[PDB]
Amino acid sequence: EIPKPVAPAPDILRCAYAELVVTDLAKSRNFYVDVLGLHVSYEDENQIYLRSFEEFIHHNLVLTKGPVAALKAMAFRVRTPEDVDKAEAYYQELGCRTERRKDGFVKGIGDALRVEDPLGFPYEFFFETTHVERLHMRYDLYSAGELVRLDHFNQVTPDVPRGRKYLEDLGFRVTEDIQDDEGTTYAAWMHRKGTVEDTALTGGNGPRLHHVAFSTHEKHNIIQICDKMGALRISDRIERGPGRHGVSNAFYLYILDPDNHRIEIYTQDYYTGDPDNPTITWNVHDNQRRDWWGNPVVPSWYTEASKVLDLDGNVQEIIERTDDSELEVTIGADGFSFTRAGDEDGSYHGQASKGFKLG
Amino acid sequence: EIPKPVAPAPDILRCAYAELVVTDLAKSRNFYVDVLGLHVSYEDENQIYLRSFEEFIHHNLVLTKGPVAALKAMAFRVRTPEDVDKAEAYYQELGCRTERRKDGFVKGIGDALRVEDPLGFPYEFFFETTHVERLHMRYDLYSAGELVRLDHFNQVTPDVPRGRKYLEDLGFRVTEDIQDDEGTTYAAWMHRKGTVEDTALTGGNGPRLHHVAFSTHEKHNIIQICDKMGALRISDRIERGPGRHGVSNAFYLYILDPDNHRIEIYTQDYYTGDPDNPTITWNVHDNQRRDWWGNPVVPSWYTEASKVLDLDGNVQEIIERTDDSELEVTIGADGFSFTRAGDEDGSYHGQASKGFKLG
Amino acid sequence: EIPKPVAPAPDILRCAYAELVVTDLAKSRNFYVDVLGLHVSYEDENQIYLRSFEEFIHHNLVLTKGPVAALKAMAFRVRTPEDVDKAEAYYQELGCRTERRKDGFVKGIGDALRVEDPLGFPYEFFFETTHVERLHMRYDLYSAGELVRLDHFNQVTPDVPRGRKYLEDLGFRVTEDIQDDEGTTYAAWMHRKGTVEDTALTGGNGPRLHHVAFSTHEKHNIIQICDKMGALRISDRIERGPGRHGVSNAFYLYILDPDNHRIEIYTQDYYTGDPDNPTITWNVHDNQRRDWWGNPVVPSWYTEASKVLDLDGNVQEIIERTDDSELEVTIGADGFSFTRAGDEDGSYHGQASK
Amino acid sequence: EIPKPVAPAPDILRCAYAELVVTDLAKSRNFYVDVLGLHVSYEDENQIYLRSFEEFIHHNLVLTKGPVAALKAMAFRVRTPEDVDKAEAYYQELGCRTERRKDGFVKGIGDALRVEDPLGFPYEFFFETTHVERLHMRYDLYSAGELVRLDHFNQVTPDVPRGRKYLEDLGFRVTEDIQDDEGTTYAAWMHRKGTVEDTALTGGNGPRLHHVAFSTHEKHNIIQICDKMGALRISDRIERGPGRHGVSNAFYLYILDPDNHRIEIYTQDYYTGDPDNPTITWNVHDNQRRDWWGNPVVPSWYTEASKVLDLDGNVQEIIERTDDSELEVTIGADGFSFTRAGDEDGSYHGQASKG
Numbered sequence A, B: 001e002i003p004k005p006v007a008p009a010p011d012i013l014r015c016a017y018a019e020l021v022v023t024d025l026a027k028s029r030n031f032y033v034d035v036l037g038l039h040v041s042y043e044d045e046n047q048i049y050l051r052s053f054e055e056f057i058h059h060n061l062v063l064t065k066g067p068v069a070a071l072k073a074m075a076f077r078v079r080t081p082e083d084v085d086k087a088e089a090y091y092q093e094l095g096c097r098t099e100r101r102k103d104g105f106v107k108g109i110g111d112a113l114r115v116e117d118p119l120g121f122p123y124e125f126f127f128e129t130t131h132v133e134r135l136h137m138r139y140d141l142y143s144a145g146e147l148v149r150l151d152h153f154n155q156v157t158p159d160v161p162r163g164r165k166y167l168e169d170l171g172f173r174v175t176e177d178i179q180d181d182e183g184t185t186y187a188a189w190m191h192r193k194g195t196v197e198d199t200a201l202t203g204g205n206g207p208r209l210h211h212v213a214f215s216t217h218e219k220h221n222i223i224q225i226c227d228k229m230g231a232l233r234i235s236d237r238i239e240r241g242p243g244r245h246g247v248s249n250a251f252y253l254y255i256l257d258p259d260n261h262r263i264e265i266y267t268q269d270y271y272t273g274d275p276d277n278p279t280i281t282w283n284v285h286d287n288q289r290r291d292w293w294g295n296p297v298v299p300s301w302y303t304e305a306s307k308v309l310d311l312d313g314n315v316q317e318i319i320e321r322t323d324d325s326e327l328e329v330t331i332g333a334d335g336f337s338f339t340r341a342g343d344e345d346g347s348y349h350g351q352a353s354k355g356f357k358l359g
Numbered sequence C: 001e002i003p004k005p006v007a008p009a010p011d012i013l014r015c016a017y018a019e020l021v022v023t024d025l026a027k028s029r030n031f032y033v034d035v036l037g038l039h040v041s042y043e044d045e046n047q048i049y050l051r052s053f054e055e056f057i058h059h060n061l062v063l064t065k066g067p068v069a070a071l072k073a074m075a076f077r078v079r080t081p082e083d084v085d086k087a088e089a090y091y092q093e094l095g096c097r098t099e100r101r102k103d104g105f106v107k108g109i110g111d112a113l114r115v116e117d118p119l120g121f122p123y124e125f126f127f128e129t130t131h132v133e134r135l136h137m138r139y140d141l142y143s144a145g146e147l148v149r150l151d152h153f154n155q156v157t158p159d160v161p162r163g164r165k166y167l168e169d170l171g172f173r174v175t176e177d178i179q180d181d182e183g184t185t186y187a188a189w190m191h192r193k194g195t196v197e198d199t200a201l202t203g204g205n206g207p208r209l210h211h212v213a214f215s216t217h218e219k220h221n222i223i224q225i226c227d228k229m230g231a232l233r234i235s236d237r238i239e240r241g242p243g244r245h246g247v248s249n250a251f252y253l254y255i256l257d258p259d260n261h262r263i264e265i266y267t268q269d270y271y272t273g274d275p276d277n278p279t280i281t282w283n284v285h286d287n288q289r290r291d292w293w294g295n296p297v298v299p300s301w302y303t304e305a306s307k308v309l310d311l312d313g314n315v316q317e318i319i320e321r322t323d324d325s326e327l328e329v330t331i332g333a334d335g336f337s338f339t340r341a342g343d344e345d346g347s348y349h350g351q352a353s354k
Numbered sequence D: 001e002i003p004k005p006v007a008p009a010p011d012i013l014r015c016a017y018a019e020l021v022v023t024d025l026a027k028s029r030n031f032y033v034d035v036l037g038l039h040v041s042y043e044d045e046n047q048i049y050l051r052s053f054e055e056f057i058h059h060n061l062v063l064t065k066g067p068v069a070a071l072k073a074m075a076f077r078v079r080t081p082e083d084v085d086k087a088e089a090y091y092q093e094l095g096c097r098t099e100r101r102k103d104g105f106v107k108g109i110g111d112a113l114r115v116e117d118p119l120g121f122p123y124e125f126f127f128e129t130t131h132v133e134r135l136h137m138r139y140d141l142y143s144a145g146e147l148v149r150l151d152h153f154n155q156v157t158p159d160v161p162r163g164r165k166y167l168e169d170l171g172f173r174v175t176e177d178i179q180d181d182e183g184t185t186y187a188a189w190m191h192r193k194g195t196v197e198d199t200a201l202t203g204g205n206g207p208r209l210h211h212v213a214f215s216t217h218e219k220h221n222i223i224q225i226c227d228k229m230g231a232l233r234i235s236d237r238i239e240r241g242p243g244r245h246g247v248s249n250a251f252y253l254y255i256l257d258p259d260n261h262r263i264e265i266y267t268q269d270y271y272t273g274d275p276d277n278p279t280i281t282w283n284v285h286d287n288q289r290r291d292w293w294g295n296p297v298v299p300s301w302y303t304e305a306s307k308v309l310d311l312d313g314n315v316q317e318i319i320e321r322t323d324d325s326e327l328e329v330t331i332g333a334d335g336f337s338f339t340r341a342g343d344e345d346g347s348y349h350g351q352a353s354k355g
């Protein structure tokens, strides 16, 4: 169990950007710019800096060329310059390695702290950032599939309660979770900015990065991404969806970048900013918890996720989950799911919903 | 092979209504009225008469209580009273059983002919119908999932080219179809009213009724149907979707009524009313043909369909398809499909797309 | 009254394209391509040929450079090649001037008949046209404001009953109209393809072209056109809307091109294909007939419209409407309208709504 | 000028509910429940307690039968019970009249402080509230016009800078405003929850309540409200819109309840939670600032607004604005507005846009 420091936690505002290492920068650019329509803040031979339609900070996504595709940093913006100092002190007390750069790790970020957190994830905390033209009313640029915000990250980690307690001490509040009747936690969602999530924990081998999520204004915008991917004959890069979530109540889609980094497109979750916001716990065997319409969760969604780097740029070693596997208990050979609690009708034994089994 | 009569074909306007036999009228009422929001034109202990939001004829759907759930009639409106006489002459020349009732078979229909057609299907042809209040501007009644029109029927039959040729002689024009490189036809779509389909043929054991389709105004209306069925904890009655079709380009959903009759909800196909409307043929192994986003077709979609009745109310005997099965050649153990023709990446062998095999 | 020819009417499928004369081709191209997103089928230094997202015929709009902005032709597709011969015999019997070009008037159209019709409008009838790539599943090209079909034309003419009867003889069926209790007709809508309209008649001084209409898939696509025009700081070229129509029940917007040609964007009217489709008549004083939400109709919408050309390319002389004016009877100084019939609450007198 | 207290400001989370006095409780019920689809948390013969589709606190709107239609309270939720003590100390030092009830003023609210604030408005601050079934996934109940959240209030007040400085001290941050080139401020928007606004100030005679605003998920939900009101033949209770705002960038509609209280329906503004969120200032003569599409703003939108009560239940006296009037300088007889700055084409002298 990760102890609560004496030092005060940094005041985190929100998730702000991710730095992803990619193997072919031009292929990646084609995906995030030509397919997804993200706005280029800066680019050169080594990096692409991208932002969403409504962003005023320099970027929400940095693509960095490197030999091994991986998450290099998931970056949170903090409330003041002094909060970056607080972050350094807090993580030092946790016994974590930290690196401080007064002039930033990436362009358009100033004083920044990166840490190898207790779950092995590379986090950044910063305040200073270059403001850019906020494109929120540039409807001359607006795409039929326009990505308007960065919304959240999702992390794969083998011990969800351990992580959850650490994120609670850092000031994140859990909005929803998935548990069973035998004491196992499979997933949790937690926030700072008053939406369902800024980060989320998914039970599995880790540290790995599950996805980064961007939002759209309306559901039809998500449908358009799917439609465009069909027209580009890259529908094989739609992993799962589109759907309605149980957890979060958002309409959603998961797609895969050229290095298999998973991106979620999301819209219309709900307000969580009250401190006693009712926490919602779903049972892992409820077949409406992940897709509210009951559609089956594709097995790659549970098994595949991105490598993460340490501060030297080396891939973090994976620690195997020993708690029960959500895949196995729901759609594997001994799995079970229900539509209506206690009703045998609409239940699934040892296979997925809608007449499918695991490939 | 079905000969083309010397007698003139009736001028068919559109699909107009279906009569389905249902086993429990109150449970069927709940589904069609309380879940789906269709509007009651007439009802009693034996039947419920339903119409869509923009309809002016008496009804689009008649639920008739009986012992065996089945299609009893699929009805087309013809242009003039004289076309009913033409339908009668045409089918008598084909050597089909016909029955004529000057005062209709169901309420709100007047002079009508029912026929056991050459494919075993119970067709009705009529002109006269009782006009009712057209609810098209009754936004005080409009539901978030409102069904606005009847769009089409889909019929299962063993020999698609044989049925197609017969429908062409009747004046239906083929818009899209699905074939393979060795000359098998798996499905065909054909219209009179200048949309993609008024009826459609799906290759399989027949005669059976695949579905009846209603349209909505917008894609979010279809999303709401899914969302409501989740809230009612009947997501197990969502069979397939929602999706974008390849064939037709419509946004779609398939759901199952209490007797397992399949209902499609559909919106935003394209104009086909020009006589040289370009036909579109798809390869059966193209994994974007049915769902444009490459999502897998649930196997029940290929295997299950409603019984149909003859003019005495007995179930029509089923005849086995001997051409190749669409299920088997795409998603069965020996099936295959592709995202990009010729590309092994994004292809599926011996299972469905997205990492599933047959349950 | 325009007599019915004994010659059979051509079988008209739908409205197909308009040829608009424009004064500055580059400015016009910026509006129809860069702002509105129509797809180029052909261009050169004299003309731009444009189509909507789901079209397979060569074009829905031809922009032709010329000295005076005007409608040059409103073209209907007919069902077979022989229907062009029918159209020629029909308009000849009507006493109208006609011109037949076996290889077409504009690129991508074959054998074509143009006429000065009895209302003074330049109509074209054709069958043959060059097919192009139908872009209906080209979602890589799809705009947030995408125009998906050509829907209809709207003509300004002084005597609506006279024009309506002429159109009915040609096979158009009236779907909706606007009348008063005194028996005046102010407008009528009529169709061939099974929607509310392929053309429509607006009472006023004519012949003038009121607008050309394109459809979108959804309401949000119309919203996006407005939002884009705001970002381009040309919100002054939004004339009226967005709104819900009473007549037609369609969601709508009216905008002005650089020569003040009016374009409607339109979605979600209803099916009219049955021969006994119920006809709806609105009262001219009903403030929900034009905009269902009761928003006022700007006077420019009633008074302004495009010149039309004769077959020589000269402007057609205009005839003044002598029947009552819809403008005057609803929003002029002696006009009125209501929200609920016979209720002075929500009524407007000598004054527009709201 | 309103001084800044030595006492620390309460930590305000968001606008939470409004209490509106209405004259005919049945007619109001019909509007808010039958037309608009709000959900009943509690009702009796004197009061209806309503909530939006995604709310879990007891209510977002209280309709209270009374003899004079008016705003009785605009309530903000604070982060902790001790924040209600802070609000009490803060307003006392301001020399504002306060009243504190441990068991609340309305049903479903616990310990609560009401104040007559320095602008004459009745604010409530509370933490304690009765939790109710969150209906956010009750799509069996979801209306085609569904109102999903309470978004904001908008207040009419004569001196916008005076008001702004006071709200800033209280911890609200200004996101957008409307000024001219002569030093006048006509309007300002400001927030706690990270949206464009929790409350907003409109320059005018006041204190008056301009409107209360509810959100929808999508733009088509607002369009459905208009379509329904047409079917119900009450399109005359549509005041302004639907439209796209300049300020806020939100899609919007303004409608009027049976006592003429103005309700806005609103969707899809942007995130403002960062402390250095760029402030946007519009010029008052910019014809895209209120409606981005340049549709004219009807003069009733500028002149009409609801009475507000003091803590005894009496109507607050109205103080006249002496700063220039937004109405007069844009759409009055000597008004002006532009489409493109510096372009005569698309400008309007002495009248509203669009004819």
Ligand SMILES: O=S(=O)(O)c1ccc(O)c(O)c1
Pocket (backbone or CB within 6 Å): C154, C197, C213, C245, C246, C247, C248, C250, C264, C266, C289, C290, C291
């Ligand atoms: O403004 S109207 O409701 O009369 C109307 C209805 C349909 C149209 O296409 C139109 O331009 C005008």
Ligand SMILES: [Ca+2]
Pocket (backbone or CB within 6 Å): A180, A181, A182
């Ligand atoms: Ca268990």
Ligand SMILES: [Cl-]
Pocket (backbone or CB within 6 Å): A245, A289, A290, A291
């Ligand atoms: Cl999920």
Ligand SMILES: [Cl-]
Pocket (backbone or CB within 6 Å): B245, B289, B290, B291
């Ligand atoms: Cl399909």
Ligand SMILES: [Cl-]
Pocket (backbone or CB within 6 Å): D245, D289, D290, D291
């Ligand atoms: Cl405004």
Ligand SMILES: [Fe+2]
Pocket (backbone or CB within 6 Å): A152, A153, A154, A200, A211, A213, A264
């Ligand atoms: Fe997520």
Ligand SMILES: [Fe+2]
Pocket (backbone or CB within 6 Å): B152, B153, B154, B200, B211, B213, B264
């Ligand atoms: Fe279908």
Ligand SMILES: [Fe+2]
Pocket (backbone or CB within 6 Å): C152, C153, C154, C200, C211, C213, C264
């Ligand atoms: Fe029109």
Ligand SMILES: [Fe+2]
Pocket (backbone or CB within 6 Å): D152, D154, D211, D213, D264
């Ligand atoms: Fe507002």
